[PDB]
Design an enzyme around this catalytic site. Structure first.
Site, PDB file in Angstrom:
ATOM      1  NE  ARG A 193      -1.561   2.092   3.180  1.00 17.71           N
ATOM      2  CZ  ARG A 193      -2.216   1.301   4.379  1.00 17.71           C
ATOM      3  NH1 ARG A 193      -2.623   0.448   4.975  1.00 17.71           N
ATOM      4  NH2 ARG A 193      -0.876   1.124   5.727  1.00 17.71           N
ATOM      5  CE  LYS A 223     -12.294   7.508 -19.234  1.00 18.56           C
ATOM      6  NZ  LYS A 223     -13.450   7.979 -19.199  1.00 18.56           N
ATOM      7  CG  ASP A 281      -8.907  16.167 -15.548  1.00 18.70           C
ATOM      8  OD1 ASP A 281      -7.977  16.001 -16.177  1.00 18.70           O
ATOM      9  OD2 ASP A 281      -9.580  15.749 -14.721  1.00 18.70           O
ATOM     10  CE1 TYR A 317     -16.125  11.310 -16.720  1.00 19.44           C
ATOM     11  CE2 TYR A 317     -16.358  11.563 -13.810  1.00 19.44           C
ATOM     12  CZ  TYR A 317     -16.425  11.260 -14.720  1.00 19.44           C
ATOM     13  OH  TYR A 317     -17.191   9.513 -15.201  1.00 19.44           O
TER      14      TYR A 317
END
Ligand SMILES: Cc1ncc(COP(=O)(O)O)c(C=O)c1O
Ligand SMILES: Cc1ncc(COP(=O)(O)O)c(C=O)c1O
Ligand SMILES: Cc1ncc(COP(=O)(O)O)c(C=O)c1O
Ligand SMILES: Cc1ncc(COP(=O)(O)O)c(C=O)c1O
Lengths: 363, 366, 373, 365
Positions: free
Chosen positions: A46, A195, A170, A98
């Site tokens: 982690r 994406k 972004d 978004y």
């Protein structure tokens, strides 16, 4: 080495001990240590993982940052970015960011003492006016989705800086292949790896990187403290996908141009939203801050009612909910995020036009 | 279907269209629609992940399951249910990272907490405020394995306006089912016993409550800290042997505890299965067994590092719950009753004799 | 030095060159050059007063205006068009009018809220809210607002706390020390004290806000003349003693009025029975001379006021002379009757500005007026 | 899939296991489980009812559908979301029983209402209280066919904290889709145009919104005003000819409107299909067609009953939206004159309908 060469040899792209031209997938949770307080570099997956780290190094290398951070999704990364702030802090959003980012603030962050103000960010003065005493960040996204609305990065950054403000960008739509916000005054860059970076519609991932060592300490802390990390297999597949980005982005651009041009000279089509068109507002700004335009383009038809019949009669574009993949995608943000969004893929350009043609003949 | 059969055939363990005895891995971000208006986008839902979610729901008797990128990703989204200005009651020895969540992330997001001894039932009564919205329980405790009455605590919790949240990581669903004991939400680190092969980082949450399920579902999708299909699949595979593993874990841990307790250089052994354990009878009451987790304090504190560093079988390392035996010193790693000399063992599934001989040789060096 | 000493020696109270224990009145519009240039930008008589008020309220800078309204106008001139402001429901009719009739036409917006209810302000905040205008105690119902609370909530959004501190003067209440960013006064009232000057005063915590206010004082030009500046300063020198006497008198009058069969409700923050008396006691070192009271029969309020012979029937307040008005027929006549009752303003509500006359003479005037209804 | 096709293959139109082109009728109350932990109890869930609910969701563009024992029971359940002390705006001529639902049932439960003309968008603005939660529209309206602008009222309600609730019974999902015009909840009396055969009493409700769906589900289950499996199935069956029936209804209704308008013995005529009708341009914009519902007031007001009682084809009865022609005086069964005749134009031959009217007119002064 140039961007094209960096996509293949950047960050960590080789196993140092074996010579493997591919970073190994470290499907592991923990690591054996020599004496206490003396580790072999990794303690717990982690906190850090050699496969994820290689990817994090790659995105940093590409955007010109000091550290990368891979996350379970785009939203998880963005969430971790905003975990830098206290309650009582303010953030300025773009008016067409978004939807999940909006919902993040609207329903998760606001709830926790975080306020936002929505403004048009291509209107420099609307940001000047919107700053409060507690505004601590400016969140930009260009090209925007849908509508592909361009915001002036250097300008906004300059303006954010003379106030005590963070510039958070972004960069999902225009990849690190076309645009580097950190080289234009940004402090933090976030992508949906889900994406274009991944580019095979087969990974869900977010990547964040930063210019600032202190910022990086903070982001690290919250990646580890909240634990929305990217797994090693996804990390590896993301990195693999990233290797082809350049060629894919080229093909994306080439196709989306043909598509935009064909669409503009069409009887059924009214307006068209694509940054590559001289006809698009702020076209000049774009060529200034982008080395290219991606494969995203919204558009509208003169007959606003047929929008759903057109989308559903296409046989090569896949009617689905994402973008940035090698397969062409299609949506209508009204019921998903008379406007039709296209994610132009890397199929043969002619087949894409012939597919749009046959779907127009039907309305 | 009994527990041991459910672990293999529970939730969705089969592919319905093909017949495949394993669920396929869906390395996919998006799905074609015949829409507009089953699966739309992998962050919102994914068949591989879903099968595991149904599995864990099925094992704990919940109505829905939720798979997160890590144990902490799961706990975090669980506390996203709360508004700023709300109050939470905590255990005085909750997992180190859970305490850090509150201290470093959640307090600055407007939540307040209060640390009480959860084994002291009256301490929870006294600590309740008007804005107290939830009680957080971890039993047995990390690293002292302290036991907390889940029925009692949830009883007192239920007759105020309170949510009973339980971390059931140590006992797994094979040995304890907090939902059947009054809890509202149950959280695991899947990184531990559920995966069991120290190769997956993962969280799992499940709930009794249909409306609570919608909220967690909202913040799983909205915050986006989701387990990937590959890790989901592997975690599911791990769970298939959960039953057998936990038995070996318990058999070995019992054996080790009885060795350490009878050992000259050892002071106290913390293990729920030892008759001399505080609330030993209560453990037998709410648990079908004890796991492989134990810690012990050795009479001379300054020798703890040397002891840990001379073990040859137990792997000196950060985690727990794997097939391989792990050892740590909580004071210097994962972090009241916790002294620098405290040593925590994660007894794996190796041969009892191999584990004893390892400890035997390490004591001979101090 | 303590507040009482500060009223006499604070800001600039002395001419450095000549030694004069009174700042000279610079009736000049200009200055020779080879630190003053133009009297609308800066004037040593006004500056002295400006320093004083800043010094009393613990500010960095003070600004003297041609009128209370002029100052409140300069403050609100900070905001751009698009900005939104939260106003108290018991705001000075003229402040409410500024927004309603001047600032709105310029692109601002407001929402009216009871500021004694903190959750109401929370419900009213929009993403484009930039300011919160408070006034405590209120006119005419003397309703108290938690300054620290409201300042804090406002701060943890992006909001400027603007407080009208006229009623409870800098002698009893200091908003800036309780989280307020800007304090405004009508110097026309208690600050001047002799009903003989019309003036506004504005001070602030914040250097950056001060540059903003300074710019608008100068560019809009609603400044206070040197004579009035000096007069206001002279008045301020007895602010302490006068407030002590106002409050003494007011307490005595309030106590008289509730002993009284014809009087129903008395509104005064110094009464233990007053809603938020305990809050009042926290943020105020005292209460003013301001009170109202409603009498049981509405139509008897006219006759009561008419037979008064010491209290002067007048529009203002805060002078050494006692003043009486009927808010429904004077300060609020424009507002539809059923809306006035909605806002707690009955036709039988009588407002007193309790002056500094002998309390007995004040009471004997009230007795004879009651005796006549 | 187009609407005409969707009426036949939408929602669930096939049994998955057997392949039956019709959904089987689950006359069951309960189901075997392999619990503890699809269908549990027919009040919570029935495969037949669900098929119909999915179909309506799919037709109106909703996320979930809800079938009730009647149009009223559905409308009831919708308003059951609201606490006491809440406020609601009502159209001045909403359905007679929708008023009687508020007037006599929901009010005494702590609800408040204001009757307004909803075709006056400024009138709704004038009536918003701080405690108001929802606006309730019904266009075209019973029985005057007054038209309300769904898109604007939705907007006006959307920038306040309000819920737009539309009774879409009259202009069916085939002509009007309120959910796409900014509505939150649509409700139908299935008893009418959806069933089409004047043989089923039913109500259908659907929504755009996930959280609203959870709520309506909860109240359908808790009050238990659910539609039976046989009625659901008959309703679905009826819906399969909706498109065909609506086209014939309109074709006949336009043919009658133009007869009544050019008639000497008739005074006014109410039909959204007539060019000379209040907000006719509004009708054309939000509707894809006008239905079979029309009303008219004649010049001799006292001879309304004699007219109605001498019709031989049209049936003097108490409903609408059926394949047979219905007639009623809405006053006996604010615009409504005690001589307003309401016509439910069926799908019989127009010549037969017109020849029934001619003969009826030719018996009054
Ligand atoms: C820009 N930013 C962020 C996101 C969210 O990414 P993810 O779906 O991986 O969370 C998207 C969605 O693709 C986007 O287009
Ligand atoms: C109990 N709860 C929660 C956690 C945190 O889980 P993870 O490390 O998978 O995020 C741990 C340790 O891993 C634990 O022992
Ligand atoms: C509080 N603030 C401000 C004002 C306005 O002050 P001026 O009349 O001096 O402009 C008044 C009344 O005049 C008041 O009672
Ligand atoms: C509009 N809405 C609602 C209803 C109520 O329908 P039901 O009587 O079937 O409940 C009717 C009557 O059919 C109507 O015309």
């Amino acid at each position: 080495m140039r961007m094209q060469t960096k996509l293949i040899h950047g960050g960590i792209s080789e196993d140092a001990t074996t010579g493997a031209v591919s970073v190994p997938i470290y499907q592991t949770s923990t690591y054996r240590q020599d004496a206490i307080g003396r580790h072999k570099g990794y303690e717990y997956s982690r906190s850090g993982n050699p496969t994820r780290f290689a990817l994090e190094e790659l995105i940093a290398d590409l955007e010109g940052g000091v550290k990368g951070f891979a996350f379970a999704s785009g939203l998880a990364g963005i969430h971790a970015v905003f975990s830098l702030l206290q309650s009582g802090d303010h953030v300025l959003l773009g008016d067409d960011v978004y939807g999940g980012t909006f919902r993040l603030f609207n329903q998760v962050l606001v709830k926790n003492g975080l306020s936002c103000t929505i403004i048009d960010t291509s209107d420099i003065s609307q940001i000047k006016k919107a700053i409060k005493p507690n505004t601590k960040a400016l969140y930009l996204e260009t090209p925007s989705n849908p509508l592909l609305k361009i915001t002036d990065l250097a300008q906004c950054a300059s303006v954010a800086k003379d106030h005590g403000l963070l510039t958070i960008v972004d960069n999902t739509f225009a990849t690190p292949y076309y645009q580097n916000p950190l080289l234009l005054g940004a402090d933090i860059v976030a992508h949906s790896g889900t994406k274009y970076l991944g580019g095979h519609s087969d990974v869900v991932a977010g990547l964040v990187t930063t210019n600032n060592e202190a910022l990086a300490q903070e982001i690290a802390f919250f990646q580890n403290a909240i634990g929305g990390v990217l797994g090693p297999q996804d990390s590896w597949l993301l990195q693999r996908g990233i290797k082809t980005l350049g060629l894919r982005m080229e093909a994306h651009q080439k196709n989306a141009l043909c598509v935009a041009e064909f669409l503009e000279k069409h009887p059924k089509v009214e307006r068209v939203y694509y940054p590559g068109l001289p006809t698009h507002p702020n076209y000049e700004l774009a060529k200034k801050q982008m080395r290219g335009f991606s494969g995203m383009l919204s558009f509208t038809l003169k007959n606003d009612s047929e929008a759903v019949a057109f989308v559903e009669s296409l046989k090569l574009f896949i009617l689905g909910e994402s973008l940035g993949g090698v397969e062409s995608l299609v949506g209508i943000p009204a019921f998903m995020t008379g406007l039709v969004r296209l994610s132009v893929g890397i199929e043969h350009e002619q087949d894409l036009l012939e597919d749009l043609e046959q779907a127009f003949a039907k309305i």
